[PDB]
Design an enzyme around this catalytic site. Structure first.
Site, short mmCIF file in Angstrom:
data_model
loop_
_atom_site.label_atom_id
_atom_site.label_comp_id
_atom_site.label_asym_id
_atom_site.label_seq_id
_atom_site.Cartn_x
_atom_site.Cartn_y
_atom_site.Cartn_z
N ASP A 1 0.78 -1.22 0.00
CA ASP A 1 0.00 0.00 0.00
C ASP A 1 0.83 1.28 0.00
O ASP A 1 1.28 1.75 1.05
CB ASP A 1 -0.96 -0.03 1.19
N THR A 2 0.97 1.87 -1.18
CA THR A 2 1.76 3.08 -1.35
C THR A 2 1.08 4.30 -0.73
O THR A 2 1.76 5.28 -0.40
CB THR A 2 2.07 3.36 -2.84
N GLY A 3 -0.24 4.23 -0.57
CA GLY A 3 -1.00 5.32 0.03
C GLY A 3 -1.06 5.26 1.55
O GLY A 3 -1.82 6.01 2.17
C1 LIG Z 1 -1.53 9.39 6.75
O1 LIG Z 1 -2.66 8.54 6.85
C2 LIG Z 1 -2.43 7.32 6.29
O2 LIG Z 1 -1.41 6.99 5.70
N1 LIG Z 1 -3.51 6.49 6.47
C3 LIG Z 1 -3.47 5.20 5.82
C4 LIG Z 1 -4.72 5.22 4.97
O3 LIG Z 1 -5.84 5.11 5.42
N2 LIG Z 1 -4.43 5.38 3.65
C5 LIG Z 1 -5.51 5.67 2.73
C6 LIG Z 1 -5.37 7.04 2.13
C7 LIG Z 1 -5.55 8.12 3.15
C8 LIG Z 1 -4.46 8.82 3.58
C9 LIG Z 1 -4.60 9.82 4.52
C10 LIG Z 1 -5.84 10.15 5.05
C11 LIG Z 1 -5.96 11.21 6.04
C12 LIG Z 1 -6.80 11.07 7.13
C13 LIG Z 1 -6.90 12.10 8.05
C14 LIG Z 1 -6.15 13.24 7.85
C15 LIG Z 1 -5.33 13.29 6.74
N3 LIG Z 1 -5.21 12.31 5.83
C16 LIG Z 1 -6.93 9.43 4.60
C17 LIG Z 1 -6.80 8.42 3.67
C18 LIG Z 1 -5.56 4.70 1.58
C19 LIG Z 1 -5.24 3.27 1.94
O4 LIG Z 1 -4.57 2.76 0.80
C20 LIG Z 1 -6.49 2.45 2.25
C21 LIG Z 1 -6.11 1.04 2.67
C22 LIG Z 1 -7.33 0.21 2.93
C23 LIG Z 1 -7.81 -0.65 1.97
C24 LIG Z 1 -8.94 -1.41 2.19
C25 LIG Z 1 -9.60 -1.32 3.40
C26 LIG Z 1 -9.12 -0.46 4.37
C27 LIG Z 1 -7.99 0.30 4.14
N4 LIG Z 1 -7.42 2.45 1.14
C28 LIG Z 1 -8.75 2.83 1.31
O5 LIG Z 1 -9.24 3.33 2.32
C29 LIG Z 1 -9.54 2.56 0.05
N5 LIG Z 1 -10.41 1.45 0.39
C30 LIG Z 1 -10.55 0.38 -0.46
O6 LIG Z 1 -9.99 0.25 -1.54
O7 LIG Z 1 -11.42 -0.54 0.06
C31 LIG Z 1 -11.44 -1.75 -0.70
C32 LIG Z 1 -10.28 3.80 -0.43
C33 LIG Z 1 -9.34 4.99 -0.47
C34 LIG Z 1 -10.77 3.56 -1.84
C35 LIG Z 1 -11.45 4.17 0.45
C36 LIG Z 1 -3.42 4.06 6.84
C37 LIG Z 1 -4.48 4.20 7.92
C38 LIG Z 1 -3.57 2.71 6.16
C39 LIG Z 1 -2.06 4.05 7.49
#
Ligand SMILES: COC(=O)N[C@H](C(=O)N[C@@H](Cc1ccc(-c2ccccn2)cc1)C[C@H](O)[C@H](Cc1ccccc1)NC(=O)[C@@H](NC(=O)OC)C(C)(C)C)C(C)(C)C
Lengths: 99, 99
Positions: free
Chosen positions: B25-27
């Protein structure tokens, strides 16, 4: 290009005329942008992350340029903290993970 | 290897002798794994994504093997829906985004 991961993979995107910044996210099935205007009609969708689900609007066949590369496909709009380019559009631009 | 994105980038990881399935997970800033036991001290941490924040347990200097690549770093443990390898560990295994 080649993007290392020591910093957030933030890139410039162009959508409906506007330049914005987006996160390249292999952990996301979908592309989700902050509140904005897009053309056409939308369908409802809910998407889930670490802390729960949100309600978003789904637009289809949206033109978007990602860091020089064109993409046309599905864009969700809603209360996301960050612009997220997910796998649906990352595949179109030929993006892969390597090591 | 080169992982494409047609499907979710799920790899086999090894942590605490246990074999587990995790999302590349690059995000993601941090690495977050579902409920499990780990040795050492820990601190509570709050981490946020789509839908908000959860409380997790932060373990430092943990060894993880990801596709036979050794890496040492911070591992967060808590009520995440999915095992997630974030940027803090992906850099260690030499992982880049390419297109
Ligand atoms: C700095 O915060 C982080 O790095 N938070 C991370 C996080 O939540 N990253 C998300 C990116 C993110 C980064 C920062 C914030 C944020 C929050 C508050 C303030 C500022 N920025 C929010 C989101 C995207 C991440 O790839 C996430 C992983 C995931 C996948 C499936 C189920 C749960 C989590 N992807 C999703 O949420 C996606 N879900 C999905 O594909 O479901 C099948 C989407 C995006 C489509 C819904 C973490 C928690 C994994 C370390």
């Amino acid at each position: 290009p080649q993007i290392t991961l020591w910093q957030r993979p933030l890139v410039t995107i162009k959508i409906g005329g506007q330049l914005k910044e987006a996160l390249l996210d292999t952990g996301a099935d979908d592309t989700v942008l902050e509140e904005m205007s897009l053309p056409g009609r939308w369908k409802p969708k809910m998407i889930g992350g670490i802390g729960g689900f949100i309600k978003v609007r789904q637009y289809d066949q949206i033109l978007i340029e990602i860091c020089g590369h064109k993409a046309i496909g599905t864009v969700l709009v809603g209360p996301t903290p960050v612009n997220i380019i997910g796998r649906n559009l990352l595949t179109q631009i030929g993006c892969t993970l390597n090591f």
